[PDB]
């Protein structure tokens, strides 16, 4: 299974840095015991040398994560940005990905990474839904994401 609470979705204000984004999306996981207290710095350390920018066609998506040993329980944290924030390209292109949707992943097994990129494929697939993510409010984004990912893996 994987834990997905209502407070794991959050809109972020403008003028936020890449570190403040990661720190903000890790606070619910730290407060719920899903990860170690140092989980924010470990994700910042990985993103610096292993970026996770994905140039999705509608809006840019980022998937910051870290190794499994700093994760207690499986969970995802979703953050909607007010302005595009650059995450350097995970592909290898010299230019970054303007990201507006951030998925903070905390999986307990490295070999499940390929399976969690597949869950995000189910959210990314709908172009119209990615547009609605930027206009919906907090509880609207939670209900839509919960049911869309609930169609396969167990949640909460």
């Amino acid at each position, epitope marked *: 299974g994987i834990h997905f609470r209502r407070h794991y979705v959050r809109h972020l204000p403008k003028e936020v840095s890449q570190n403040d984004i990661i720190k903000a999306l890790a606070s619910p996981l730290i407060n719920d015991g899903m990860v170690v207290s140092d989980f924010a710095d470990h994700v910042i350390t990985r993103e610096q040398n292993f970026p996770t920018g994905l140039p999705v066609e509608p809006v840019g998506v980022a998937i910051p994560h870290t190794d499994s040993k700093y994760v207690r329980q499986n969970a995802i944290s979703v953050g909607i940005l007010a302005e595009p924030v650059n995450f350097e390209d995970a592909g290898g292109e010299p230019d970054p990905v303007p990201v507006r949707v951030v998925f903070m992943l905390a999986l307990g097994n490295w070999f499940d*990474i390929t399976k969690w990129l597949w869950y995000i494929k189910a959210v990314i697939q709908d172009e119209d839904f990615m547009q609605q993510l930027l206009v919906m409010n907090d509880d609207e984004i939670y209900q839509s994401i919960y049911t869309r990912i609930s169609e396969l893996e167990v949640l909460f």
Partner: antibody
Amino acid sequence: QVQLMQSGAEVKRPGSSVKVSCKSSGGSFSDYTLSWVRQAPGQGLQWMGSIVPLLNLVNYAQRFQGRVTITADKSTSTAYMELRTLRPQDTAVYYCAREGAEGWGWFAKPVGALGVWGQGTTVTVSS
Amino acid sequence: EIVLTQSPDTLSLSPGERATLSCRASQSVGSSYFAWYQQKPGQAPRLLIYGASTRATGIPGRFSGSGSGTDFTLAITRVEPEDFAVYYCQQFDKSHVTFGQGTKVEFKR
């Protein structure tokens, strides 16, 4: 669905290096993990490392302690395996393997286990 | 790491008997992270069972995996001449992969 084609057999002296390649076929190259498993003549299977090309994330068997380097060339859909400072006991058949997937196409659900295997590359280390 | 111990080393039976292979783990492995493989002489291994109990595509119904925690079992209901080979169990639960030593299923005459 997917075919894994590896490079030919290689003969190397002790202390040298081996770079085994593995070209993928029909199916998403970057979305699924590529693993390298070797097998000494008459013995069992030993995992060496895995890689996810989309994120360029590589996970190694810590017993090799840096002797192994696994890279992926996304443009040509080829994964590489480099084993340095070879010993005679490194003589084995080196297999390229892709994780299995439930379904077809871009929405094939990753499975974890190795469902697609390469034909294997014989590496002989001797003077 | 998680050590996998297979039993028995060799299984000697005639075609038509039931074949039961056991794989014991030193730590608990999640069922989603367990798999069985078959290898014939000269060929690469082939995936039989994944997720501890799910058959791979094209694997006949006479193969059935089961078990959880630390005890996993592979069963072959009616062994056939093309089922005689070496079977390896595999886990990949805690970010690392280990295999069993292998069980050779041989034709008993």
